[PDB]
Amino acid sequence: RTIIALETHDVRFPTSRELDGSDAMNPDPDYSAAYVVLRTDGAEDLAGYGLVFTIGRGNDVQTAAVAALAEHVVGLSVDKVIADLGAFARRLTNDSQLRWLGPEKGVMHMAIGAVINAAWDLAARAANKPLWRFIAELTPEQLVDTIDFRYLSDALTRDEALAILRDAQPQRAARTATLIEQGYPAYTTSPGWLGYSDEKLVRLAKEAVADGFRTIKLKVGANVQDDIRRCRLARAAIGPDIAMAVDANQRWDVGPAIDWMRQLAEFDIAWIEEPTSPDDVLGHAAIRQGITPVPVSTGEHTQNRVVFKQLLQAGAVDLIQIDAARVGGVNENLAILLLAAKFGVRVFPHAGGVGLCELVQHLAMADFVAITGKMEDRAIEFVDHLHQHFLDPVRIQHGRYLAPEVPGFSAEMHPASIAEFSYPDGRFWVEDLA
Amino acid sequence: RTIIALETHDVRFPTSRELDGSDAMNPDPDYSAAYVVLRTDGAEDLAGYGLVFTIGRGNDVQTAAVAALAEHVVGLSVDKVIADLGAFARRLTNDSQLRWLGPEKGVMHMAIGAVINAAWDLAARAANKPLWRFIAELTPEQLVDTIDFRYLSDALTRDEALAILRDAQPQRAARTATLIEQGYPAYTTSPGWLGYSDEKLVRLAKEAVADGFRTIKLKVGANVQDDIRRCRLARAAIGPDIAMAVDANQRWDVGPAIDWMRQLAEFDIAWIEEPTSPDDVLGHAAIRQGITPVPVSTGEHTQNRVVFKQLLQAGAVDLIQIDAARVGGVNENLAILLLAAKFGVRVFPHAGGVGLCELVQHLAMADFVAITGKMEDRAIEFVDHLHQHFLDPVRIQHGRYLAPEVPGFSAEMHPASIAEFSYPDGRFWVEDLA
Numbered sequence: 001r002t003i004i005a006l007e008t009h010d011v012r013f014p015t016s017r018e019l020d021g022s023d024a025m026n027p028d029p030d031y032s033a034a035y036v037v038l039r040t041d042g043a044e045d046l047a048g049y050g051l052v053f054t055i056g057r058g059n060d061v062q063t064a065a066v067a068a069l070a071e072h073v074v075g076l077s078v079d080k081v082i083a084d085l086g087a088f089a090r091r092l093t094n095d096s097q098l099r100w101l102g103p104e105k106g107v108m109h110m111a112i113g114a115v116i117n118a119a120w121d122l123a124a125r126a127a128n129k130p131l132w133r134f135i136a137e138l139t140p141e142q143l144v145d146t147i148d149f150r151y152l153s154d155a156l157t158r159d160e161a162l163a164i165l166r167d168a169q170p171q172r173a174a175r176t177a178t179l180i181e182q183g184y185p186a187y188t189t190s191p192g193w194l195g196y197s198d199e200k201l202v203r204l205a206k207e208a209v210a211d212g213f214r215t216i217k218l219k220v221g222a223n224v225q226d227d228i229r230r231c232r233l234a235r236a237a238i239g240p241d242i243a244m245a246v247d248a249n250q251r252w253d254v255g256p257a258i259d260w261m262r263q264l265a266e267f268d269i270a271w272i273e274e275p276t277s278p279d280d281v282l283g284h285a286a287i288r289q290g291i292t293p294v295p296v297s298t299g300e301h302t303q304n305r306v307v308f309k310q311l312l313q314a315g316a317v318d319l320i321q322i323d324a325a326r327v328g329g330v331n332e333n334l335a336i337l338l339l340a341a342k343f344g345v346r347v348f349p350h351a352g353g354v355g356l357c358e359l360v361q362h363l364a365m366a367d368f369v370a371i372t373g374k375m376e377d378r379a380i381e382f383v384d385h386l387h388q389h390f391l392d393p394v395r396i397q398h399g400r401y402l403a404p405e406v407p408g409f410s411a412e413m414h415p416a417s418i419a420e421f422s423y424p425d426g427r428f429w430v431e432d433l434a
Numbered sequence: 435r436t437i438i439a440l441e442t443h444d445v446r447f448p449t450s451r452e453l454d455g456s457d458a459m460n461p462d463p464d465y466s467a468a469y470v471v472l473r474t475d476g477a478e479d480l481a482g483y484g485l486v487f488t489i490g491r492g493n494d495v496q497t498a499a500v501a502a503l504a505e506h507v508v509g510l511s512v513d514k515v516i517a518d519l520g521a522f523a524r525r526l527t528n529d530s531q532l533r534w535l536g537p538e539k540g541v542m543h544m545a546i547g548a549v550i551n552a553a554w555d556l557a558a559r560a561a562n563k564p565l566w567r568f569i570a571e572l573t574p575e576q577l578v579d580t581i582d583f584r585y586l587s588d589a590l591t592r593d594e595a596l597a598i599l600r601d602a603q604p605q606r607a608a609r610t611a612t613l614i615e616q617g618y619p620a621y622t623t624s625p626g627w628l629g630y631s632d633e634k635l636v637r638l639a640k641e642a643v644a645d646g647f648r649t650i651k652l653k654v655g656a657n658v659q660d661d662i663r664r665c666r667l668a669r670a671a672i673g674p675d676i677a678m679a680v681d682a683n684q685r686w687d688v689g690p691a692i693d694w695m696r697q698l699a700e701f702d703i704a705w706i707e708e709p710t711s712p713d714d715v716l717g718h719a720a721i722r723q724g725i726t727p728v729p730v731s732t733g734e735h736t737q738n739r740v741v742f743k744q745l746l747q748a749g750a751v752d753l754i755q756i757d758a759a760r761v762g763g764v765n766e767n768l769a770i771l772l773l774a775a776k777f778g779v780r781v782f783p784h785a786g787g788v789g790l791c792e793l794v795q796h797l798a799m800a801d802f803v804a805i806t807g808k809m810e811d812r813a814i815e816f817v818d819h820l821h822q823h824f825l826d827p828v829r830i831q832h833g834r835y836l837a838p839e840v841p842g843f844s845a846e847m848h849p850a851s852i853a854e855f856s857y858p859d860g861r862f863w864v865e866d867l868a
């Protein structure tokens with residue numbers, strides 16, 4: 001069997017109509033996916049699916065970046081790809097000319113990450129396993145073979161990664177049973193989009209708690225008076241026991257961030273996400289030093305494992321977000337999860353975007369089983385949008401993610417959805433733009 | 435007058451045929467330009483030119499990214515653009531949806547930087563001044579109005595930037611005279627490409643010194659025995675007085691970098707460039723601490739001013755490279771140059787690529803006149819390749835850059851060159867690919 005085509009689609013959803021996903025930095029995002037399919041000449045079931053998440057404009061550029069990887073992947077043996085995902089990833093990340101466009105950051109790296117993710121989807125499908133089990137059931141040797149240890153020898157070596165993975169082997173099966181029976185903790189951000197009225201914020205916050213979520217997140221960062229008012233209203237709506245996180249989406253400078261949080265601390269903050277630039281490691285550390293013990297996090301825009309290494313080394317975070325589509329695919333997220341485990345820093349996956357809940361749940365679950373054995377101390381983000389467009393939509397029960405069962409990364413989208421929302425010739429857009 | 439079109443071209447040169455530009459990370463680069471033209475309905479002379487430098491594959495993606503900015507720029511008033519370059523830049527850098535593809539890093543940011551650079555070219559042309567004079571002759575107020583001070587309040591405020599620029603005003607004219615009469619120090623990397631034979635290295639090293647260059651640079655990083663042999667041969671060829679820098683192009687990890695340099699120090703190293711990942715601020719600092727006083731530099735791949743701020747704060751560098759096309763255009767490089775000046779760190783501009791010498795010379799010259807008043811303590815990189823394709827090619831005299839005189843950023847390329855090397859339908863490529 002061989003990969004006979006790399007198909008790409010520019011799919012965009014009009015989330016801006018109701019300001020779903022709105023925040024202090026992105027006031028009107030249109031959740032989009034640079035969707036990719038690795039087609040094979042095997043069974044219709046044998047294909048890999050993946051996507052890069054963007055928020056509208058630029059999605060065509062992101063799609064073109066993914067399409068440019070066809071030369072590298074078309075013609076490859078499926079058996080060889082799924083048997084050495086490290087080699088598959090390296091063919092792309094070690095292309096020095098593509099590295100120049102990054103290296104390992106921005107559009108070109110996310111495009112590479114989507115194709116790598118599609119390869120893991122293909123591997124899991126071939127193994128007839130949901131991705132989280134596929135990953136968690138690989139041997140420690142197989143797992144480290146997929147990781148790029150360059151630039152990490154000062155923090156995580158192959159031998160050190162092997163040790164962590166081997167330490168978990170005895171409890172892998174038991175943890176798998178626990179996850180299947182109990183699900184994984186989740187928190188929701190849907191009640192907190194910044195573009196919503198105070199009335200809507202309160203209504204949704206209450207519905208979130210009524211739905212079983214033990215934690216919710218509010219967007220902040222544009223106006224301190226608005227933030228004080230909204231945080232007070234939300235805290236009153238959810239009660240004193242529910243956790244409430246806030247997210248500034250990179251809006252502040254170091255000094256202003258510390259002063260801003262000084263005005264929100266009274267509302268019992270679970271953590272402040274992305275108080276400043278996603279590139280400012282020293283800055284996050286300075287902010288953390290100034291607002292401690294109020295927890296600081298960042299991660300959804302962290303470009304690669306090298307920056308994550310520094311965030312951990314510098315003590316710039318109390319917890320981190322990981323994102324399924326921001327980095328170099330599964331291979332890179334495995335390195336990031338191992339780094340987090342070694343440094344004893346909790347991971348709260350980001351999932352604010354179309355298909356992100358579907359994808360990232362697998363990484364968190366694989367981590368629980370094969371890496372940390374810890375989930376009750378953390379949570380996976382959840383947003384109540386666009387799940388209807390996926391064949392295997394995430395399922396939430398009493399505020400917890402149920403473990404996926406069908407084979408794959410849960411990335412496959414309904415062809416009808418692609419036909420309706422492809423930009424700009426999709427049925428919805430042709431009429432909307434008209 | 436209005437901008438009526440944003441034209442883009444995927445131009446690639448077969449530099450890999452003779453391995454020109456080859457290094458430890460990029461063994462066979464094909465110097466390329468994602469060329470852009472801001473056309474107006476004014477005089478044929480009234481147009482802005484710019485380009486993103488890449489090394490081959492991916493240049494089509496980079497070109498597509500630039501093309502995607504047409505919606506933002508086509509239709510704009512030329513007078514309004516050139517009168518507020520800060521506002522022009524912000525229209526692009528503050529587009530939250532385009533920020534998602536970065537933010538301020540990779541393909542999308544370099545595309546934005548090229549269009550911003552083309553706008554500065556347009557402004558300089560309208561003023562009938564070479565870019566370095568256009569920049570250096572703007573008032574301190576006009577200059578700070580173009581800068582993005584976000585994420586820099588802890589290191590460089592608007593008031594602090596104004597102070598630095600105002601301190602230089604008294605000597606601006608005198609410095610301009612000095613530069614015009616003496617030129618700016620240069621160093622050459624052309625003798626050191628890693629793919630060259632020992633014989634070629636020696637021959638070119640000698641020619642470089644004979645041509646007046648007081649400093650040369652050798653590529654290192656793939657094999658320590660090769661590096662020891664080559665450094666010994668080059669040092670013997672140039673004599674004990676000529677400066678010799680080495681460049682590893684990001685190949686090493688922290689520990690290995692320190693051990694590697696321990697074996698090259700005996701050859702009197704001017705500085706080691708990019709010993710590790712361009713994202714590892716803490717890593718460069720650790721390497722610097724281990725090999726001091728051997729100078730450490732980085733910068734050609736530094737994504738934006740925020741990372742530069744940290745390199746300076748952390749004391750990760752002894753000197754830095756800046757690059758005309760890696761960041762957000764002139765606006766960002768002005769912030770970087772001011773940060774470097776405030777921290778008292780020398781700047782040695784990178785120019786290893788097509789059109790980079792032509793572009794970056796203007797930033798170094800503007801810095802000398804309006805910011806530091808220091809040039810004899812530093813140098814602009816030079817490579818002896820592809821200058822024939824530019825209308826205003828750089829001119830080197832006795833190892834020094836002569837100050838450009840014609841209006842513009844020196845980015846305009848010969849239409850004949852574009853027709854010959856456009857990929858893949860250009861005259862040269864249609865026949866070469868056949």
Ligand SMILES: O=C(NO)[C@H](O)[C@H](O)CO
Nearest residue numbers: 021022023026029352353
């Ligand atoms: O930050 C996020 N969620 O945490 C989202 O990705 C962002 O707000 C865009 O909707």
Ligand SMILES: O=C(NO)[C@H](O)[C@H](O)CO
Nearest residue numbers: 455456457460463786787
């Ligand atoms: O690093 C460089 N010059 O310093 C070049 O850009 C690189 O070697 C690609 O030719």
Ligand SMILES: [Mg+2]
Nearest residue numbers: 247273300350
């Ligand atoms: Mg967030």
Ligand SMILES: [Mg+2]
Nearest residue numbers: 681707734784
């Ligand atoms: Mg270099």
